[model samples]
Target: GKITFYEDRGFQGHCYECSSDCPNLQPYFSRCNSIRVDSGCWMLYERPNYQGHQYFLRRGDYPDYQQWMGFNDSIRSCRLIPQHTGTFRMRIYERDDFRGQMSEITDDCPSLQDRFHLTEVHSLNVLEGSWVLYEMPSYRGRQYLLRPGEYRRYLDWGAMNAKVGSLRRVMDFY
Candidate 1:
């Protein structure tokens, strides 16, 4: 995927376009206030080396950091998210190693507690496609990018604990 970072809002000021992933993008631009993603999904980080907060982006134009729900204007790293053309599938468990109450989901779930009566997910398995896990309900708050793989625990998905608020499939095919 291709993306452009601008120092000023609305795609103005010094801008740097990137086509691949970068662990550190400080040299690309002093400050990232705006961005334009031309193709593919992307995960923009607030700090270097893919650390700190993560913001997911699809093909579109962001006039300012707020457009992407950015905490501030500090974008220090980026990752080109890999998308799957096939269907999306995932299973959540109440215990580690895929134990306890389990549910197989193939679509976006707005509120896990409302749907599955689970406030937190201890473990999960991504059968297909990529996804984004939110720390708060209604698709808000902290974000964690999940690819097709097996996450035996919440820490495996980069969360400090197992408190997952909602889940959404990164259906780039759409």
Candidate 2:
């Protein structure tokens, strides 16, 4: 999937189209005021190298900054979320390197704190399907995409910290 970022709202001004991880978007254009996700799911960051606030975007048109839940009209980085199918299986660990308590989730977890009695998730093992991890309960806050693989630490998924509040599989929209 590809995403187009515009310096001005309504898809005007300088534009940069991307279909994969862009660590530093500043070189492509100025600040991003609007975006258009042509296909698949994606995560945009407010700072370079995938740092700062995150916004999850699916295939659609975001005519303005507010459409993607932006605090300001600037985007520094982005990552394309890969599509997947099959049973969803994920193991979340309370500590890094897959240590401490672990919980396997097959369905949506609206609150990781409620399910594991822990507020921090340091490691993860995504055994099947792609998934989305939200920083707040009820699928609010920043989102991190987890593909089928192992994340030994929170940083492995571009998170600044080891805090995960909710999670769900990335299902097809059509």
Candidate 3:
């Protein structure tokens, strides 16, 4: 009996149909299929960004820090935490990659740098998942929300992990 392997992405073939003497007995299909399979099995090779990474800027970073600012509003305004209360934290990392990192900061992260400066904010937001509510100053509260294209920076972290290196070492740009 011949068994036909079917994949959702138009991958289908008969295992028995392969040539016996064929150096590679594996079924032949589009390279895309192989890439997909390789990506699934070789998880480490894919890198973290492709897997999943998200970022959410808190409204409190802004001067108008408000609770209902929402994810879109935060991006439109730019910067997380409307007012750097030192209490508000930015939600780094994509939803998927964050799960792999620290569980507590999986989605939301506390302010690594206490002072407000563009140069000092070198932390990459690789944490994904939903936002966890955290108290802020002046009646303002922050929530973790997904930011578009914000997670790309985290892809390199994934590469580092795939290549067997901690993110910090990779950040050193080795």
Maximum-lDDT candidate = 1
Report the number of the highest-TM-score candidate.
1
Query: How high is each candidate's TM-score?
Result: 0.93, 0.82, 0.18
lDDT of 1 by residue, 20-41 (tens): 9999999879999999998989
Q: What's the best-to-worst order under TM-score?
A: 1, 2, 3
- Model 2, 42-76: lDDT tens digits are 87888888778878888888888888878888799
CA RMSD for every model? 1.5, 2.4, 19.1
Score each candidate by Cα lDDT: 0.89, 0.85, 0.22
Model 2: residues with Cα > 4 Å off, grouped in runs: none
Model 2 scores a C-alpha lDDT of 0.85
The order of the candidates by lDDT, greatest first, is 1, 2, 3
